[PDB]
Amino acid sequence: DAPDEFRDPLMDTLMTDPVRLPSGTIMDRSIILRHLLNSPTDPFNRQTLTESMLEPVPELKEQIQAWMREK
């Protein structure tokens, strides 16, 4: 299994492409972008959210790729 900080909020899925929202939530880029196709909102607190507000988390993305190298 994988540590919680490498997984999407509430989910079992590994974030291969983590992004931070302005609120502080970190989640996979592929989830939040598909949510934004339907609604211009942060899905958790309902604030306005657009794609340009998302930030990469390079150190976490690298740490996750490093963890994937344990097979």
Side-chain angles (χ1 to χ4, degrees), residues 5-32:
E5 81 175 78
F6 297 172
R7 284 184 288 111
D8 281 301
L10 278 181
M11 293 179 58
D12 79 16
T13 45
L14 206 76
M15 291 187 295
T16 59
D17 202 5
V19 297
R20 186 184 189 278
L21 281 59
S23 67
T25 299
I26 297 172
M27 63 194 294
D28 202 80
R29 188 179 191 260
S30 69
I31 299 179
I32 187 56

Side-chain angles (χ1 to χ4, degrees), residues 30-49:
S30 69
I31 299 179
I32 187 56
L33 292 191
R34 291 180 303 111
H35 166 77
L36 294 172
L37 293 174
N38 212 299
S39 164
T41 58
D42 177 306
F44 313 101
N45 64 23
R46 304 190 49 63
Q47 290 182 15
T48 289
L49 180 72

Side-chain angles (χ1 to χ4, degrees), residues 46-60:
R46 304 190 49 63
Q47 290 182 15
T48 289
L49 180 72
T50 66
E51 168 172 357
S52 69
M53 325 175 172
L54 304 168
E55 291 300 327
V57 192
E59 299 92 339
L60 177 61

